[PDB]
Amino acid sequence: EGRVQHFTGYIEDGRGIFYSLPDMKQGDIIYASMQNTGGNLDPLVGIMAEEIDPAVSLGQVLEKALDLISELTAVADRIFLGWDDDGGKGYSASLEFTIPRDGTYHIFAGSTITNQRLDKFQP
Amino acid sequence: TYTTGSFQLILGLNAPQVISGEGEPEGEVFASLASKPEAHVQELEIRLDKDTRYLTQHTRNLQPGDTFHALVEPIGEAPLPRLRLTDSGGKPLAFGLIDQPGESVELNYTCDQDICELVVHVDGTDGQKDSGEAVYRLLVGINSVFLESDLVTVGLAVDQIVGVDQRSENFSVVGTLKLSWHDPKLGFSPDQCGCTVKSFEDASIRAVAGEINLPLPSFSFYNQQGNRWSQNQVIFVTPDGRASYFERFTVTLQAPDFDFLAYPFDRQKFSIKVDLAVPTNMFIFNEIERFQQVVGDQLGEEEW
Amino acid sequence: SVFLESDLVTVGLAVDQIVGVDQRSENFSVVGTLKLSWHDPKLGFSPDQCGCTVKSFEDASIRAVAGEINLPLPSFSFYNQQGNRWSQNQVIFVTPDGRASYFERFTVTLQAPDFDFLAYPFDRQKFSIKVDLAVPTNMFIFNEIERFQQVVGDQLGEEEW
Numbered sequence: 001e002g003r004v005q006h007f008t009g010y011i012e013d014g015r016g017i018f019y020s021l022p023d024m025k026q027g028d029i030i031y032a033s034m035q036n037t038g039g040n041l042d043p044l045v046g047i048m049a050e051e052i053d054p055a056v057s058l059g060q061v062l063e064k065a066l067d068l069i070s071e072l073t074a075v076a077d078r079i080f081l082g083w084d085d086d087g088g089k090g091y092s093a094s095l096e097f098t099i100p101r102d103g104t105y106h107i108f109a110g111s112t113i114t115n116q117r118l119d120k121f122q123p
Numbered sequence: 124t125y126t127t128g129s130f131q132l133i134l135g136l137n138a139p140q141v142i143s144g145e146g147e148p149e150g151e152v153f154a155s156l157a158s159k160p161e162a163h164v165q166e167l168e169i170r171l172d173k174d175t176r177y178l179t180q181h182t183r184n185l186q187p188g189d190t191f192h193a194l195v196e197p198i199g200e201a202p203l204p205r206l207r208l209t210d211s212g213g214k215p216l217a218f219g220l221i222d223q224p225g226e227s228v229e230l231n232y233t234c235d236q237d238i239c240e241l242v243v244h245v246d247g248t249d250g251q252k253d254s255g256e257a258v259y260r261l262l263v264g265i266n267s268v269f270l271e272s273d274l275v276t277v278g279l280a281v282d283q284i285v286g287v288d289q290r291s292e293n294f295s296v297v298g299t300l301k302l303s304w305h306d307p308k309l310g311f312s313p314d315q316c317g318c319t320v321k322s323f324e325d326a327s328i329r330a331v332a333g334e335i336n337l338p339l340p341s342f343s344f345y346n347q348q349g350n351r352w353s354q355n356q357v358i359f360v361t362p363d364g365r366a367s368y369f370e371r372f373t374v375t376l377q378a379p380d381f382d383f384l385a386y387p388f389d390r391q392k393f394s395i396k397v398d399l400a401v402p403t404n405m406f407i408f409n410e411i412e413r414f415q416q417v418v419g420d421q422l423g424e425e426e427w
Numbered sequence: 428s429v430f431l432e433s434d435l436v437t438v439g440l441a442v443d444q445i446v447g448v449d450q451r452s453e454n455f456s457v458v459g460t461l462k463l464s465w466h467d468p469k470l471g472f473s474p475d476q477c478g479c480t481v482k483s484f485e486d487a488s489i490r491a492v493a494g495e496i497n498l499p500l501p502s503f504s505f506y507n508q509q510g511n512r513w514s515q516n517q518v519i520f521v522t523p524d525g526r527a528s529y530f531e532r533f534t535v536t537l538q539a540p541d542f543d544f545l546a547y548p549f550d551r552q553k554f555s556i557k558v559d560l561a562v563p564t565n566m567f568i569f570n571e572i573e574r575f576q577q578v579v580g581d582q583l584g585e586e587e588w
């Protein structure tokens with residue numbers, strides 16, 4: 001009947017927290033759901049088997065007054081094997097991922113890059 | 124006439140409980156939503172002064188499955204502005220792509236959630252405002268494309284100029300205030316009361332909005348000193364969404380537009396400013412109601 | 428950031444009318460405009476609930492809004508206030524970011540025993556409008572002065588003082 005875990009955490013600056021999954025199996029289906037419980041955080045949840053650092057070029061995407069959906073889509077799709085953007089529940093802060101091969105994987109729990117204001121667009 | 128609003132529909136197949144007011148969902152599904160779509164398109168010429176250089180317009184309400192197109196164009200040789208679309212929260216859904224010739228910055232989007240509630244942005248953030256008059260044609264569409272401010276007709280009349288403080292540069296006046304305004308979201312359904320009219324008495328538009336938890340055109344006398352003595356205060360709401368406010372009042376107002384330099388041969392301005400307390404994008408004054416003589420001629424009285 | 432720092436408020440003031448001076452009782456009255464803007468992440472508004480950038484609390488005292496929200500805010504008092512103040516267009520705005528602002532046109536009566544009328548009419552005077560916080564330095568402090576409008580507004584004909 002499925003197996004479930006709970007976690008609570010804090011995204012401090014925008015930069016995310018890593019959770020390690022050892023002994024993942026070929027075929028097994030990972031379900032992840034990330035809900036805001038305080039602050040203005042719009043969640044981003046993702047999966048990767050290799051630890052290469054998202055903060056630096058996500059930092060570089062912020063620097064661009066550039067469109068952006070395409071720029072962020074391209075970066076995300078390249079850095080994560082599967083990913084999803086909080087958008088409350090409208091963007092269904094949640095994914096389903098079937099594990100391609102045996103090994104240790106890591107899920108990323110953090111912030112997306114969004115605009116919050118109507119008075120100016122500064123994401 | 125035809126009537127409007129929201130409803131709860133209970134459908135039952137071999138279920139006598141449904142005609143008794145009793146809808147608890149049960150059993151196998153038999154029914155749902157039955158069927159290009161319908162389109163809606165709007166003009167507006169937006170204008171971008173030194174005063175106003177970012178502008179946003181809240182869209183009204185797209186069904187999952189709906190496509191949104193928008194195009195800006197220069198009126199004179201004014202610069203191509205930055206265009207984008209966004210949700211009510213400000214998360215971006217699109218950007219403006221400047222076109223093949225380079226005369227129109229166009230943008231495109233079709234809709235995800237069972238409510239998409241979109242917001243269009245255009246900015247003249249790009250350069251220093253040289254004479255502050257570059258103006259644009261904005262085209263918009265889905266497939267009343269923009270949700271509009273409901274329109275209030277305000278009226279005022281004065282019965283007595285009852286005090287003038289020459290030292291402190293203020294005065295006092297007695298008068299009558301009326302606002303009438305048609306908002307469907309106000310709508311009273313008649314069988315509850317058994318009447319055409321619902322009355323709220325002895326309270327401030329503000330207070331009634333709070334009680335009802337909806338938006339209303341609240342206001343303040345701009346230069347009011349302290350408190351105002353308001354009598355025959357009332358707000359009327361009919362079923363239709365037609366609404367009215369009536370208030371005789373006695374208010375004390377600061378007017379530093381006084382100059383007493385050529386006293387007694389001076390002349391003066393008594394200005395009674397009534398501002399709203401909500402932006403232009405929700406309510407605006409649209410008409411002036413001459414509901415009575417504006418200034419009430421008792422001439423013997425005489426001081427001013 | 429290993430020690431907990433006071434969040435930093437930028438306050439601003441401007442006067443529109445010097446409307447009363449009581450020379451006997453050594454006080455005066457003034458009409459003006461008060462603004463405090465201050466960034467506190469702890470009332471972060473998440474946008475999809477309201478469907479807006481802005482959350483507004485209107486017609487109440489920072490104190491009262493803190494009480495309603497049950498969190499800490501930079502409340503203040505005009506220091507030498509006599510009796511009550513007539514406050515209009517009162518409001519406090521909070522965006523998602525934790526950026527917050529207070530706006531209040533007011534009409535207040537202030538005790539100034541810094542009056543000396545010894546060389547009347549050749550006397551000169553100080554109208555001081557002191558705005559203290561009501562919370563210590565270790566929670567909130569004033570960090571900037573906002574020149575949001577002309578501080579004193581030049582109508583020169585008016586003339587008494």
Ligand SMILES: [Ca+2]
Pocket residue numbers: 453539540541542543
């Ligand atoms: Ca003294």
Ligand SMILES: [Ca+2]
Pocket residue numbers: 292379380381382582584585
């Ligand atoms: Ca004057």
Ligand code: NA
Pocket residue numbers: 284285286287426
């Ligand atoms: Na009089």
Ligand code: NA
Pocket residue numbers: 290291445446447448587
């Ligand atoms: Na005076």
